[PDB]
Amino acid sequence: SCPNLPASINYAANPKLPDPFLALSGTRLSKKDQWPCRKEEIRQLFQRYSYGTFPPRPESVTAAMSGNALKITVSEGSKSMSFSVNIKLPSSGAAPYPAIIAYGSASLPIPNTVATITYQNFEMAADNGRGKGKFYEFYGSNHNAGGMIAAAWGVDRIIDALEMTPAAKIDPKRVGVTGCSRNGKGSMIAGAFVDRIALALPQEGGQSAAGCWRIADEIQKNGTKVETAHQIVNGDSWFSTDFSKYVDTVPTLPWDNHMLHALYAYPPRGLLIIENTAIDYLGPTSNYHCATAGRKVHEALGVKDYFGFSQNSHSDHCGFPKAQQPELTAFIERFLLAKDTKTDVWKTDGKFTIDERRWIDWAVPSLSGL
Ligand SMILES: *[C@@H]1O[C@H](CO)[C@@H](O[C@@H]2O[C@H](CO)[C@@H](O[C@@H]3O[C@H](CO)[C@@H](O)[C@H](O[C@H]4O[C@H](CO)[C@@H](O)[C@H](O)[C@@H]4O)[C@@H]3O)[C@H](O)[C@H]2NC(C)=O)[C@H](O)[C@H]1NC(C)=O
Secondary structure (H helix, E strand, O other): OOOOOOOOOOOOOOOOOOOOOEOOOOOEOOEHHHHHHHHHHHHHHHHHHHHOOOOOOOOEEEEEEEOOEEEEEEEEOOEEEEEEEEEEOOOOOOOOEEEEEEEOOOOOOOOOOOEEEEEOHHHHOOOOOOOOOHHHHHHOOOOOOOHHHHHHHHHHHHHHHHHHOHHHOEEEEEEEEEEEOHHHHHHHHHHHHOOOOOEEEEEOOOEOOOEOHHHHHHHHHOOOOOOOHHHHOOOOOOOOOOHHHHOOOHHHOOOOOHHHHHOOEOOEOEEEEEEEOOOHHHOHHHHHHHHHHHHHHHHHOOOHHHEEEEEEOOOOOOOOOHHHHHHHHHHHHHHOOOOOOOOOOEEEOOOOOOOOOOOOOOOOOOOEOO
């Protein structure tokens, strides 16, 4: 349906967030029916420069309920791998149930109307181990995928297995995803690459997730210690070994993380970013300005209200404040509990400067076809 990227891309150093509506072809999007092919371009850019290859569904996926365990087996040629996820069914409403996949564990309050699928994402592909995890046992240790995109592949397989196994009692069309800190990152990427996810809730994922690389670079340049591209490729195997060629030349990247958010605008799905203005290393002003740029794609495609942003000041990392509950309730209501509640939430309590034009030198086009 869409072409692959040129063998090589020449992108002139740009100190602002690249126009998400500007195809590498050269033509700027003016028609809705062009967006799908730009969306793949973006997906392919992320995999080449930062994430590694997000593989397709393997030749076999099979699943099997075994008590509360959903045991998912896959194979490709003679190779086979199994990974198990715990499902804790809720105590309110009737099957098939809406669910949330938690990277390791939730730090959001999940209502008693929504199932809790507990995904062992570091078990799938390790936190700080190059080529370690089920993913790499299956595909090879030398496979160029990073532990973030390999975890996201596991979420694609989790949903394949819920489509195959009504026994699990989970509506496949209403599976959310969430995580905090490192799993804010994972959950954000899972939701960006798995189109079938109904709602992503990344919490305090900061840079790589909510924040843009260019703004992290400028936060650093201004004196405050923050999670820059240069920093993030060190304590972990989250990104492909290729990412560390580019960390020092961010302005020449034909993309930024605002285009990760853009992947959520088609097919339209819920994205509430929950963030913390108090912790410097997240880059509070990056998160806000980066998100605000990402939502421009949602705005063009008339699905603005499917992308929520909430930034709150709290000393404790990953402690959900009660202040952010109405916003979380609303997004769970609309996209998981199939209720009809409004979700235009875009707020920070942060006291930094809010200047869009600093990062966004491009206009939201009127897309015809919608
Ligand atoms: C990194 O630090 C640099 C420091 O240079 C910083 O870039 C600068 O940001 C400031 C803050 O916005 C810019 O200064 C602005 O300039 C306009 C006029 O040119 C002023 O009117 C703005 O002020 C208003 O805001 C005040 C408080 O909100 C109001 O009380 C007041 O009445 C005005 O309405 C403001 O001074 C400056 O132009 C840029 N400089 C450059 C080089 O672009 C950058 O913001 C910092 N980056 C990060 C990541 O923090």
